[PDB]
């Protein structure tokens, strides 16, 4: 189905800004959340499954978990991924979904036919399962999702059916924190209301925090009101068109298979050892080989995004940045800020040095505004934090 498509997508790949173009093209109706969109792009393009011999299966699926307080467009992200991805099935932790997580065998209500209704984990064997309300799942649903994520298989022993059928889906889950408000004081594991084994099987953990930020609120309100105005019934790169993005995904998943021959084992091992040392230097969740494997998966995903067929050092650095950002956000504030300061080298990769300065300015002005709102910024503070040299570019 891709002839002139395949003609043009190669040129788009050589465009050399295709990664940013895709990351901006994901969820055109959702404002902000660049990190979430980047993670979703990596998940959409997936990794490279492998199995040394036939005895050490390792998944090539990048699982994502958006844990966030209400009003953060997690449902919209899941719905957009449903719309874009092929073989994308939307299931909910409640009982109000067309499909369910657990497989059963029964006579169909309509077909009146004795059918083995496999779960929403199996109906996306080579696709994406969008599990909304991931925190409100039954015991059987939790066990089914555990089995699928850890084994990629679903075992039925129901009537006379003793079978084990494969469900190799990529799980994109949406969840709310305990109490309906994420608290960085506590860690992600004790904020999310999920079991640690369940959490571990997720490559990306997006903490979608909501804060009262003047500029963000104004821009989001502008976006929402504009969408309403233009959809009223009486009627920095350019995003790719959605159909072109779909075909790009098809080609990237079908043909290019990135290989890991050229990756700095020394650099990555040093990073892993340093992360472990810093992990037990404070009272935080340690990093594990699981994280380096997830970083490998994300590096393969970036290589697939750029059709490289080989993971390049920039791909490895971007995968490391995603893995770090996630692992850091999973920590409590006390250790989160410490690790961010210690490993700012990795976190700052592929940052033009304007976003960092803008965030520093935003935090300074937020401190000032919270001071003022209760009681009733200088160039020096900004330059000091920059030292922690060029502000003309940021000002202009």
């Amino acid at each position: 189905l891709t002839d002139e498509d395949v003609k043009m997508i190669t040129s788009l790949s050589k465009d050399q800004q295709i990664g940013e173009k895709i990351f901006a093209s994901i969820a055109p109706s959702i404002y902000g959340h660049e990190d979430i969109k980047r993670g979703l792009a990596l998940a959409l393009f997936g990794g490279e499954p492998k199995n040394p011999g036939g005895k050490h299966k390792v998944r090539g699926d990048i699982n994502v978990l958006l844990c966030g307080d209400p009003g953060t467009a997690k449902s919209q992200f899941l719905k957009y991924i449903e719309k874009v991805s092929s073989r994308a099935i939307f299931t909910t932790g409640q009982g109000a979904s067309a499909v369910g997580l657990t497989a059963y065998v029964q006579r169909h209500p309509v077909s009146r036919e004795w059918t083995l209704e496999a779960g929403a984990l199996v109906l996306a064997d080579r696709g994406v399962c969008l599990i909304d309300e991931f925190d409100k799942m039954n015991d059987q649903d939790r066990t089914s999702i555990h089995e699928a994520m850890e084994q990629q298989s679903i075992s039925i022993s129901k009537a006379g059916i003793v079978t084990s059928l494969q469900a190799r889906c990529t799980v994109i889950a949406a969840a709310n924190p305990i109490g309906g408000r994420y608290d960085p004081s506590l860690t992600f594991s004790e904020n999310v209301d999920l079991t640690e084994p369940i959490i571990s099987r997720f490559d990306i953990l997006c903490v979608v925090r909501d804060t009262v930020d003047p500029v963000q609120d104004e821009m989001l309100a502008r976006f929402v009101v504009g969408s309403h105005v233009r959809h009223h019934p009486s009627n920095g790169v350019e995003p790719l068109p959605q159909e072109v993005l779909k075909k790009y995904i098809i080609y990237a998943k079908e043909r290019v298979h990135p290989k890991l021959n050229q990756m700095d084992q020394d650099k990555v091992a040093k990073m892993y050892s340093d992360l472990r040392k810093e992990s037990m230097a404070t009272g935080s969740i340690p990093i594990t080989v699981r994280h380096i494997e997830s970083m490998i998966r994300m590096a393969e995903a970036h290589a697939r995004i750029h059709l490289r067929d080989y993971v390049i050092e920039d791909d490895v650095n971007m995968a490391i940045r995603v893995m770090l950002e996630s692992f850091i956000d999973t920590q409590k504030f006390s250790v989160m800020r410490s690790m961010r300061k210690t490993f700012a080298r990795y976190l700052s990769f592929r940052r033009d040095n304007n976003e960092l300065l803008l965030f520093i300015l935003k935090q300074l002005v937020a401190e000032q505004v919270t001071y003022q709102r209760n009681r009733f910024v200088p160039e020096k503070d900004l330059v000091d934090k920059a030292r922690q040299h060029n502000l003309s570019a940021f000002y202009d």
Binding site: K50, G53, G54, H56, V58, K259, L260, N261, I296
Partner: protein, 41 residues
Amino acid sequence: HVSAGEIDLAKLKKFIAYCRVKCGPRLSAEAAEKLKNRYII
């Protein structure tokens, strides 16, 4: 992740099955004596 004198998986399965079906061992007298003394200690 990059690469992806022993026994392969299927051969190991078959070897385990054959050993289980064929051989059921028993402890010897001296082996039992040593095991008893070590267990007492």
